[PDB]
């Protein structure tokens, strides 16, 4: 374990890290003193000898330079103090151990390495200071802070190794992660706060700042966008400038809570061809969310486009924020005098509730519910009362905070903060817990020697009603310290336990690989799975989509999918199809729709069988909402003209498309049936969305766009397949172990201890339970 599975390596660097808004995502800022030490053995060829000769002329004491020359004989020339490092005549076939230089592929790493995303490849960018510099939207997979963190760097030594770094482990390749089938990176901190401050309808920009922001976009087209206001004064909206960073052909739809198509509170998000229509931009739009900007762009334009998108968004928002400013002080912790009066009134009211319950318990007039102790009921009730009091005081505070409250600004943006933060800082920090219960009688029948014996009051057992603004009393201080000490012990223990758990998982699944027969075997030929994930899809190519045959009344299902040419009232309106009236009452063209509806009903029955609770949103490979939205733009569909789609076209084309979807390839019955199984749910999705009434009335496609959608679905499906050689065992182990490392803290074992019980198949669980229906 110390010299074979892991050892010390040459060509390695390690340094304190800091952030840089002006570094591209896949770039790493390398100190010049480090670049002079790490070398690459470039072989002299006619393509490099004019460059390598000058490099070696520079020498090792300055960069770009070189440190050694290796000849055909195998002898080594030390350029530091060889007498002939001025008359070096380079011959082809030699090697120059040249200095590391810009846009070299290097392997950047932070420890612990719970992730393949913990060791990603970066392009070298030699910078003139002693710290490793990296873009902020790469801090998340590394879990890197800039408070003293050190990170390590490794240099490949062969063209094959550089190829592996740049075409497998590169940062843009790792944007969408198979763990959680979502992006692992997003816009954070200053960028995330300013992007919300900037996307408001109150945010307007004048010509000078607009032009500076426009030029700040590196991939700018030079077309100054026409302002949203012209006559009184040329004024741009922050959304207008920000959409310059968004590539053309990007469509994003999302509705949040009270979102009309007029979005009164500027909720949700609507981006129509890289120009946002409505919606304040915050962590839902631009974070590492499922279906956010990053997911859509990475899947639509590609990893490199998204990687530049990170930089463009940062460079516009950071500039706007730099010239707009943002701060925070104790002012943002104060609520109105009326508010604090209500808050302390609420706290006293809950204290009176507890006192009444306590006198009731002392009178032996309590009705302990079945199962639990009298005292257990008393505790439960008091803890519930105090938790409610803290939360109600917190809501009073949060309601009282204006929209200028910088803490509320950060919380609304999602950059930093939560409800409990505001509540404890400005209303009441709440109840303190040790080992999951209130403060115990560490003394004889009392918590502190300043209390009388047998005192179960909120104050005596660890209820802090003061806020961090107000100030904690000595007993409240000690109780808070007791809880916080428990928190530190939990942290320092969970780390070691989860490291051991992660190592056991990785060692147990390290040899699991998808072979070329689409199976999932190990170092013995033993089969683990016959199809990886029972569907054979790379998890990075999978997104939550709704199965539209699951939900709704049977009446709405009929209204959506039923096509009856044998009824004047339930037939395709002739404005939805060129063959409108010519198709009414067609007997032969109704057996097709009847088989379509029959398979749709069978789909609904099957899916309701599989997904009992009727949950329609499930992670499936190919996103068809986006393909339809694209087809409505690449072919500029208008909804007044009728389509040119024969019913035969739609139905038989979707049938053929189902036939054309492949995961396995063999020509025998059992492999054909395994293929037919592995595509069943996706074909259910296909039938739910590619229905004749749907394709005609819900998005009026033409035959051109329809064939385009068919081919695009086929392509993306074939591109979402697992790649043979994928080490899905290590990926699975790390994808389970990393979220376990972030586990930290109702009478059930959970978290790391329960995971340990599951993994060691412990016979004597601490909480065995039977759930009887």
């Amino acid at each position: 374990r110390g010299n074979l599975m892991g050892k010390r390596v040459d060509f390695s660097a390690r340094t304190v890290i800091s952030g840089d808004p002006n570094l591209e995502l896949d770039q790493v800022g390398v100190p010049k003193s480090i670049a002079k030490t790490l070398t690459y053995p470039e072989v002299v060829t006619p393509y490099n000898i004019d460059r390598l000769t000058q490099l070696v002329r520079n020498g090792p004491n300055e960069h770009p330079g070189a440190k050694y020359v290796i000849r055909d004989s195998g002898d080594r020339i030390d350029l530091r103090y060889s007498k002939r490092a001025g008359d070096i005549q380079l011959q082809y076939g030699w090697k120059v151990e040249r200095h590391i230089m810009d846009n070299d592929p290097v392997l950047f790493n932070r420890q612990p390495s719970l992730h393949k995303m913990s060791m990603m490849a970066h392009r070298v960018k030699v910078i003139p200071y002693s710290t490793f510099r990296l873009n902020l939207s790469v801090t998340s997979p590394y879990n890197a802070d800039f408070d003293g963190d050190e990170m390590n760097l490794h240099v490949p030594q062969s063209e094959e190794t550089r190829a592996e770094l740049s075409q497998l482990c590169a940062v843009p390749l790792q944007i969408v992660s198979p763990q959680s089938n979502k992006p692992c990176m997003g816009i954070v901190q200053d960028t995330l706060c300013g992007i919300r401050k900037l996307t408001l309808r109150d945010t307007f920009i004048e010509l000078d700042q607009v032009l500076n922001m426009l030029y700040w976009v590196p991939d700018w087209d030079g077309v100054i966008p026409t302002p949203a206001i012209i006559k009184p004064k040329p004024l741009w909206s922050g959304k207008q400038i920000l959409s310059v960073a968004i590539p053309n052909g990007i469509h994003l739809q999302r509705f949040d809570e009270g979102t009309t198509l007029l979005s009164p509170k500027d909720n949700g998000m609507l981006i129509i061809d890289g120009q946002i229509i409505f919606g304040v931009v915050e962590k839902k739009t631009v974070g590492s969310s499922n279906g956010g900007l990053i997911h859509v762009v990475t899947r639509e334009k590609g990893p490199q486009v998204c990687a530049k998108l990170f930089g463009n968004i940062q460079k516009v928002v950071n500039f706007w924020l730099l010239h707009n400013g943002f701060s925070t002080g104790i002012g943002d912790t104060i609520a109105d005098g009326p508010t604090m009066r209500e808050i302390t009134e609420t706290i006293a009211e809950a204290k009176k509730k507890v006192l009444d319950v306590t006198k009731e318990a002392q009178a032996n007039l309590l009705t302990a519910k079945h199962g639990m102790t009298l005292r257990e009921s008393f505790e439960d009730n008091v803890v519930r009362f105090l938790n409610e009091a803290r939360d109600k005081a917190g809501r009073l505070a949060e309601v009282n905070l204006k929209d200028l409250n910088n803490v509320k600004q950060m919380v609304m943006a999602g950059s930093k903060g939560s409800f409990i933060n505001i509540a404890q800082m400005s209303a009441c920090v709440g109840q303190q817990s040790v080992e999951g219960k209130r403060i115990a009688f560490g003394f004889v029948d009392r918590t502190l020697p300043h209390f009388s014996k047998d005192d179960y009051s909120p104050e005596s057992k660890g209820f802090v009603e003061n806020s961090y603004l107000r100030g904690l009393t000595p007993q409240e201080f000690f109780f808070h310290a007791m809880g916080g000490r428990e928190g530190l012990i939990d942290t320092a223990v969970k780390t070691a336990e989860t490291g051991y758990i992660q190592r056991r998982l990785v060692k147990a699944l390290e040899d699991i690989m998808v072979h070329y027969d689409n199976t999932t075997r190990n170092s013995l030929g033993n089969v683990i799975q016959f199809i990886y994930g029972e569907d054979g899809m790379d998890a990075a190519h999978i997104e939550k989509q709704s199965l539209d045959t699951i939900g709704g009344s049977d009446a709405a299902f009929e209204k959506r999918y039923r096509v009856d040419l044998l009824n004047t009232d339930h037939t395709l309106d002739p404005s939805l199809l060129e063959s409108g009236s010519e198709i009414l009452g067609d007997l032969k063209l109704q057996v097709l729709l009847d088989e379509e509806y029959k398979q749709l009903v069978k789909d609904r029955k099957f899916l309701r069988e599989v997904f009992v609770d009727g949950e329609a949103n499930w992670p499936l490979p190919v996103n068809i909402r986006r393909i339809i939205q694209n087809a409505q733009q690449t072919f500029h569909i208008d909804h007044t003209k009728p389509s040119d789609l024969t019913i035969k076209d739609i139905v038989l084309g979707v049938k053929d498309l189902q036939e054309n979807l492949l995961v396995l390839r063999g020509k025998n019955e059992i492999i054909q049936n395994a293929q037919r199984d592995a595509v069943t749910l996706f074909c259910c999705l296909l039938r739910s969305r590619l229905a004749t009434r749907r394709v005609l009335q819900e998005y009026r496609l033409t035959k051109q766009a329809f064939d385009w959608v068919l081919s695009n679905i086929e392509a993306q499906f074939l591109r979402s397949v697992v790649h043979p050689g994928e080490m899905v065992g290590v990926l699975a182990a790390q994808s389970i172990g990393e979220p376990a490392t972030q586990m930290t803290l109702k009478k059930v074992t959970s978290g790391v201890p329960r995971l340990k019980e599951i993994l060691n198949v412990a016979k004597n669980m601490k909480t065995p339970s039977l759930t009887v229906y």
């Binding site: 009184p232 004064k233 002012g331 104060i334 109105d336």
Partner: protein, 264 residues
Amino acid sequence: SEEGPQVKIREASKDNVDFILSNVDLAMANSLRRVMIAEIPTLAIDSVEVETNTTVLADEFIAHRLGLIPLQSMDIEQLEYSRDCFCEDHCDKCSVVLTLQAFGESESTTNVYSKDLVIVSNLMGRNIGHPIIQDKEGNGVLICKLRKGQELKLTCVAKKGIAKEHAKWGPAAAIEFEYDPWNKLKHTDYWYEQDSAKEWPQSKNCEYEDPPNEGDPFDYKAQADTFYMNVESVGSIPVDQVVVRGIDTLQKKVASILLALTQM
């Protein structure tokens, strides 16, 4: 007087000038104050050789303090940058050599000020190198303290530089800078609990501008063209000279750009 930016001096001393800069685009005023901070030259100690140091301080400590000492720089344009002069290390046309020797002869602690600095090089009749002394008791900056027996004997070389290279070459301390004291342009959105007008204090410069009319709409085409400035000098260069040389330096940079265009 002359068409263009106008100046009205509110108050003036040998250390401060408070004035109003009218009919100026803002970027010019900002560039002027940046230049007054960063770009105008000064004489300061840029080398120290320590023959003896028996003090409780370190040589580099004292060297830092000596570099921070203010020295006379009125006739500084009559001095050469050592990087531009043709001497070996320094000459009389690019540098000024100061000498400082002090000894603890008295039983009581013997302080070492900047009045104890001795010019050794030949000034050639220019106001240069005399340490600035504004202490009312005639001494200078307290540079060191000596116990009976300790001594400090050293030679400094003072060269030409600007605050960009090191802050010791800064002639100005603080530049007070305000505009639109009523926030008519709405250039900042005030933060409040109950009332912005009551929780934010009123500017001394509010009196010099008429209060807005509440019934007036927002002047969406207004621009900042009247600034309130106060320049404070360390004393190495007089305040009037600080601002005048700031202006001259800025237009000299612009002329350098123009000459580069000519050469292209």
